């Protein structure tokens, strides 16, 4: 037998297809309205009255109503170094997220697999993504053990990538599914802010921004090409996937894993940089297939913060309806990093089904999924809806 | 315009092909024969006679002649916490490797690209792998920046996987190259032991094994499908790629990133586990091809330790010269983790040319590449040589 013959028999035929979506969050629901009172109490910072006033404004303008957090008051009372702005606490943080990340990931994966309707032994690939903690063997191994997947599942562990990774994992699963016949890829993004939670500082307001925006959550997706008729139910098709680094964006967002845990730094105008350059990525993606009206697409954008959405909306003159699904998730979950865009994808097909629309993409044919993160990196995924 | 139409024009035709191999190490060469004297001196443990005696026997049995290490005596003098067995030192270690890992990686990448002969702007994908530190943005961004790759290069950052990742990155690049027409993938593995280096402890001899085996190094590979005639020169073909977790190997190899840096643990007979199970991976991979004689293959195996090679050799009854290239790399470089098999792959084709053999695979047609690591995980890649 020749290599050319193996290649022919080994590869799939059709486009990568989203076959199921499942989501999960911690049980502790934290409402944004009174978070500043709670936050400044548990971090023993109630004497910092002016800084609390600043934080109240941050939360009021975050356009977040609630978040879900693994960290509770009880847990934080047992981990006082985590409550400090900067105290040695990495070990404490790691002990938490090394367990919680794959645990929450399992919940999302179970729901996705349940929707899927196929035996979990049919899962051939696993892409696990997180920005919360690192370990060897990784969370991918732990999840495989918790779920009881086949030991010969082909795993890819994606650590410490940040907010754009939601697009990255789809970009990955696409090539895995399309290049391997019978391949069914379980994608899981799980994020826990226990690694980034910390007390307030008067001279580090960019770190406070994180405390106002980031929430916990996990999302899982099954992806495969050549869907089995009747048995499997396509939701979306992955058409193409691009990644790029924005011009003049060096050091805009930095995150370092230190003895004090994961630190968060903002140096440049992230909303300005994204809105200034995003149309270039839209052109690159959609010019080949003859689309120039961005309002004719159904949208999924990472809600890093409300300012990104507002300025992208303004720059492109998007109708308010376009980013409704995005803003809805931001409102009800906050910024769950890499998992966000998968929650939003789930929201789009939900509202489409509920409204009884022509397609899973709000009745539209083509869509776009955006991830934004450190780099500054922009992930662009072209989507097609299903009837 | 249809999705099906896009897919047909989007994919590549032929098998993923290795077009170039480049390697690099720190300039500081460390002699293994006298390493026990040096190591126990620089870690202020000269008074630990019995332990030093044990370490001398470890080093003598390691079958390593020398290693290359970024860590010099000068650097260790300025970072005393790194010399201790367990002292807070992660920040010091991170400051080192966040820079060195992409620096050494670029050195290897430049060599590969030079052999390749094409413009670096023809690189469409970057797979970067390392077990040495984490940062946001990651080493993949830094490499893209330093090397001057196009901003829209599609990056995959693989952190904290360990020794089996040498096979993982090939499995990855295989799908990226074969599913995307014109795709050319730069794969880079870069490993720096500055994260794991620590002083000796009476009651943690498994950690001491690491100090005897692990060395620094980086390897880079250009991978693509549909090689251009004349201008590009194929070296190997990637036929298939598998991954699996061995039975009853739970917790055989653990690695934890903590405030003392990266720790290393052994709990089970790793050589025994691999040797006992490796033939299952061989059959699973080669029964389809119609091969059952493992001596008809050319071999690349991760030299985790000499014991693994010796027990695999006897278990399969391999002719002694089958693991010649593997042992040669172990002797000259030690265990460079994920980069090892790429050094060995380079050794095989150089050695074959030097012998004037009919193929790049020691004059043979089919070959196998193994990675072993935390899981206990095994990666298996079927290779085909080039005339």
Numbering used by the authors:
A (entry chain A), B (entry chain B): 2 to 388
Publication text:
Type III PKS catalysis involves the loading of a CoA-tethered substrate onto an active-site cysteine followed by chain elongation via iterative decarboxylative Claisen condensations of malonyl-CoA. Linear poly­ketide intermediates undergo a terminal intramolecular cyclization reaction to produce the final cyclic polyketide product. The five-layered αβαβα topology of secondary-structural elements of each monomer is consistent with the ‘thiolase fold’ originally observed in thiolase and present in all known structures of type III PKSs.
BLAST searches and analysis of the apple genome showed that one of the cDNAs was >96% identical in amino-acid sequence to chalcone synthases from Malus. The crystallographic model of MdCHS2 contained 774 out of 778 residues. The active-site cavity of MdCHS2 is conserved and isomorphous with the previously characterized cavity of M. sativa CHS. The gatekeeper residues, Phe215 and Phe265 in MdCHS2, separate the CoA tunnel from the internal active-site cavity and affect substrate selectivity by acting as a steric gate during substrate binding. Residues of the MdCHS2 pocket include Ser133, Glu192, Thr194, Thr197, Gly216 and Ser338. Ser338 of MdCHS2 resides at the intersection of the coumaroyl-binding pocket and elongation/cyclization cavity and stabilizes the conformation of elongated polyketide intermediates. Nonetheless, displacement of the region B loop is not observed in any available CHS structures.
